[PDB]
From Swiss-Prot:
FERM domain mapped to chain residues: 4-284
Complexes and interactors: Interacts (via FERM domain) with CADM1. Interacts (via FERM domain) with PRMT3; the interaction is direct and inhibits the protein-arginine N-methyltransferase activity of PRMT3. Interacts with PRMT5. Interacts with PRMT6.
Tissue spec. comment: Expressed at high levels in brain, with lower levels in kidney, intestine, and testis. Detected in lung.
Localisation: Cytoplasm, Cytoskeleton; Cell junction; Cell membrane; Cytoplasm
Portion held of the full protein: 107 to 390 of 1087
Function summary: Tumor suppressor that inhibits cell proliferation and promotes apoptosis. Modulates the activity of protein arginine N-methyltransferases, including PRMT3 and PRMT5.
Protein name: Band 4.1-like protein 3
Highest taxon, organism lineage: Eukaryota
Gene name tied to this protein: EPB41L3
């Protein structure tokens, strides 16, 4: 039996290596990674890989790994797939911990925009969790933390993290992690997966997929939002992604909104992430 070596970037930035039989389905690798992480609440997570145009794809746990990575290296990342709208309801602190690690990367990367004060508050909870109670000894007036807090660091931000850290004396890691989540979960881009698209008039938009529904970011003025109840059906054809919207009571006919995606693969990827999030919505 022939086995392929897999490399998985974990959310702490470390590498996990294991072997699976070469015809293995994604679930086999995912189960190994989750066991390594002592993770039981597995349904919120997934593995991604980078394709031959270097975009993120979810590894489908039901399909052979070889038919998804195809020509590429068996290199993957471990990621949050479904962001819980209420992290306080997860059963395990270790689940909340990995969710925090993912969000820290969402913030540093700029995928999750955050005000100065929220960047500092989130950072303050990360420090409390990681180092425990504030200590002046390892924090001079010139202190800069090893922790990455934001897409752009300033001395201002470092100082505000320290000032807020001082207020958390006696907080345990699980408590600090829960506060981090209670704040992060309220950010307007929490758990929003963004896709570049053009509207039916060829105007560049962003489509966001999340637990509550679909977002169309035409720009800062006019964000259209479709709760999952409002979406009748989704479809893709060629480079096109179409959404059917229920009529208001007594209107007779649903409306169709069409979008142009970069290519066929980008359309299919959007479709699949919408289907997966809609099932998520359905079962909450
Ligand atoms: C899961 C998906 N099915 S379908 C028939 O492909 O549109 C769906 C069905 C109703 C609303 C939204 C979505 Cl995403």
């Amino acid at each position: 039996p022939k086995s392929m070596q897999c490399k998985v970037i974990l959310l702490d930035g470390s590498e996990y290596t294991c072997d699976v039989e070469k015809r293995s389905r994604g679930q086999v690798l995912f189960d190994k990674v989750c066991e390594h992480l002592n993770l039981l609440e597995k349904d919120y997570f997934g593995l991604t890989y980078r394709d031959a145009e270097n975009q993120k794809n979810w590894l489908d746990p039901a399909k052979e790994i070889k038919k998804q990575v195809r020509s590429g290296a068996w290199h993957f990342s471990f990621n949050v797939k479904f962001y819980p709208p209420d992290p306080a309801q997860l059963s395990e602190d270790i689940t909340r911990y990995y969710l925090c690690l993912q969000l820290r990367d969402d913030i540093v990367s700029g995928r999750l925009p955050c005000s100065f004060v929220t960047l500092a508050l989130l950072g303050s909870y990360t420090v409390q969790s990681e180092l425990g109670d504030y200590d002046p000894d390892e924090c001079g007036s010139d202190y800069i933390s090893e922790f990455r807090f934001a897409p752009n660091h300033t001395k201002e931000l470092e100082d505000k993290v320290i000032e807020l850290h001082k207020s958390h004396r006696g907080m345990t890691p699980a408590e600090a992690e829960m506060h981090f989540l209670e704040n992060a979960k309220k950010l307007s881009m929490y758990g929003v997966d963004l896709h570049h698209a053009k509207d039916s008039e060829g105007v560049e938009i962003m489509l966001g997929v999340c637990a509550s529904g679909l977002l169309i970011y035409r720009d800062r003025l006019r964000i259209n939002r479709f709760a999952w109840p409002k979406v009748l059906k989704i479809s893709y054809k060629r480079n096109n992604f179409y959404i059917k919207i229920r009529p208001g009571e007594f209107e007779q006919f649903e409306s169709t909104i069409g979008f142009k995606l970069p290519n066929h693969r980008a359309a299919k990827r959007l479709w699949k992430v919408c289907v997966e999030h809609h099932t998520f919505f359905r079962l909450l």
